[PDB]
Write a protein that binds this ligand. Structure first.
Ligand code: GOF
Length: 491
């Protein structure tokens, strides 16, 4: 008969999955696969929190596929190596994927499409990771992605309204389509543990961001309910991970960005009684869309050299200073607490991202945004290659049409956000004995207060790695020199 395979990569969900929906129709068998390769050289920068989140996403998909008398098939290796084997072993004639706009993904999928055509396999590709067809955005702009956010808002406003999200895969949708299964299915296709991937899980606590579609849909309800109770304002509690947080689920595809969009539009129309909401309503959704669009045709989006849209800034190379930043031992408790939360949990507030990005690049250390991006790629759960690269370029003053002239204070920003320093004490236990007057600048604490706090600066917690007033004055001057001769730094 017609034997079909749906290939999960992103879109780790059964709701709003047009590719899986189309693949099942007219099919006699269906197998959903995820191709996992934790040893891939190109994935050497993936942190353990990302691996854990993904594995929890796969367990949730497997559990939800159980409800449809199916299972997830987890397969080890590289798609180019695995798919020809599967095409023959399973006699596959249909393969479905959610479209991937990112350059590496487009390249991989082009190769797989060639293997499928060679094997007599029809390839079904449907767009569902983004709100729009990004290629249509670019065509509407004249063939180039809009290089500014409000130009992007202009084009998007002129587009056709979004079509309804695809129906969720139910028993009545599967119909006669079945999944051939064996009693030993877990031995060959089961979802592995972190330990089974060779990871020592020593030092791991319960995940602050549990993966999966079930979690995402539960959080979506809470998120809308809280919104039922304009751009929000950050306070101290905003720094903590929220049970209403959706951002990692949108990144992995646990939550459909189109479903989220429609639920937001639905809620707005109920409270504000009109169908033309402020683009404010969608929060980061269009920033998300903006960076996917800017990156899709730029294979060097994550680089400075050879990247046509990036300002060629002469950053310093300082591996020791970069390591202090990445490992949260800069000696600035505000910076270190943020980098510690990021490493421990996999999410930090957007304004905390601005703070540590400024400190590393244009503000204090004058280290390339490429190096910050690599660290964030390792640890951050909610930012794809396209969004990470674009965000680091924009925030480091590396885009020609976005400048920041105010340098974040690595003491005052934290003190102004959380005056008592509860955030510091939560993530930097060595500093817990310091009173609020010194918690953001413990080097200013007299020797007696340090001894009482059982924390000698330079012994138990490092001294501040730079003099911020001097470093920022020099770096503000350097950035002013660059933008005074901006065209000279065009590649
Ligand atoms: C520093 O490292 C990172 C920082 C942020 C992220 N990040 N993660 C996600 C998203 C983003 N990024 C942005 O939303 C974004 C928005 C505005 C700008 C900006 O230039 C600007 C202009 C005017 C005023 C204020 C700001 C830059 C970035 C959206 S998402 O895909 O949903 C999940 C990743 C790494």
């Amino acid at each position: 008969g017609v034997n079909a395979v749906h290939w999960f990569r992103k879109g780790l969900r059964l709701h709003d999955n047009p590719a899986l929906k189309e693949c099942i129709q007219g099919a006699d068998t269906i197998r959903c696969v995820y191709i996992l390769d934790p040893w891939f050289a190109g994935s050497s920068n993936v942190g353990i929190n990302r691996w854990r989140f993904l594995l929890q996403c796969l367990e949730d998909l497997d559990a939800n596929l159980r409800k449809l008398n199916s299972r997830l098939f987890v397969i080890r290796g590289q798609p180019a190596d695995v798919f020809p084997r599967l095409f023959k072993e399973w006699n596959i004639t249909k393969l479905s994927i959610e479209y991937d706009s990112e350059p590496f993904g487009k390249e991989r999928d082009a190769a797989i499409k060639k293997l499928a055509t060679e094997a007599g396999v029809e390839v079904i590709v449907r767009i569902s990771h983004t709100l729009y067809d990004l290629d249509k955005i670019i065509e509407l702009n004249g063939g180039q992605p809009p290089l500014t956010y409000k130009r992007f808002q202009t084009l998007v406003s002129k587009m056709e309204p979004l079509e309804m999200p695809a129906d969720t895969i139910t028993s009545d949708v599967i119909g006669k389509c079945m999944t051939p299964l064996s009693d030993d299915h877990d031995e060959k296709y089961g979802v592995p543990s972190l330990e089974e991937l060779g990871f020592d899980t020593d030092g791991l606590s319960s995940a602050v961001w549990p993966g999966g579609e079930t979690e995402a849909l539960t959080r979506l309800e809470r998120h809308l309910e809280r919104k039922a109770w304009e751009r929000p304002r950050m306070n101290a509690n905003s720094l903590l991970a929220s049970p209403t947080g959706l951002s990692p689920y949108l990144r992995f595809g646990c939550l459909s960005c189109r479903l989220f969009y429609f639920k937001l539009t639905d809620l707005y129309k109920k409270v504000k009684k009109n169908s033309s909401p402020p683009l404010s309503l969608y929060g980061q959704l269009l920033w998300r869309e903006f960076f996917y669009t800017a990156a899709t045709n730029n294979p060097r989006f994550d680089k400075m050299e050879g990247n046509p849209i990036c300002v060629q800034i002469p950053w310093d190379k300082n591996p020791e200073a970069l390591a202090k930043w990445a490992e949260g031992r800069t000696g600035f408790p505000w910076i270190d607490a943020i980098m510690t939360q990021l490493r421990q949990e996999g999410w930090i507030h957007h304004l905390a991202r601005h703070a540590v990005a400024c400190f590393l690049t244009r503000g204090d250390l004058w280290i390339s945004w490429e190096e910050g991006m690599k660290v964030f790629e390792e640890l951050l759960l909610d930012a794809d290659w396209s969004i990470n690269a674009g965000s680091w370029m924009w925030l480091s003053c590396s885009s020609f049409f976005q400048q920041f002239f105010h340098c974040y204070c690595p003491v005052g920003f934290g003190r102004r956000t959380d005056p008592n320093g509860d955030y510091i004490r939560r993530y930097l236990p060595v500093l817990r004995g310091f009173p609020a007057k010194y918690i953001y600048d413990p080097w200013n604490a007299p020797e007696g207060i340090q001894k009482v706090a059982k924390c000698l600066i330079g012994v138990n917690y490092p001294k501040p790695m730079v003099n911020h007033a001097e470093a920022s004055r020099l770096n503000i001057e350097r950035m002013k020199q660059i933008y005074q001769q901006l065209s000279r730094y065009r590649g």
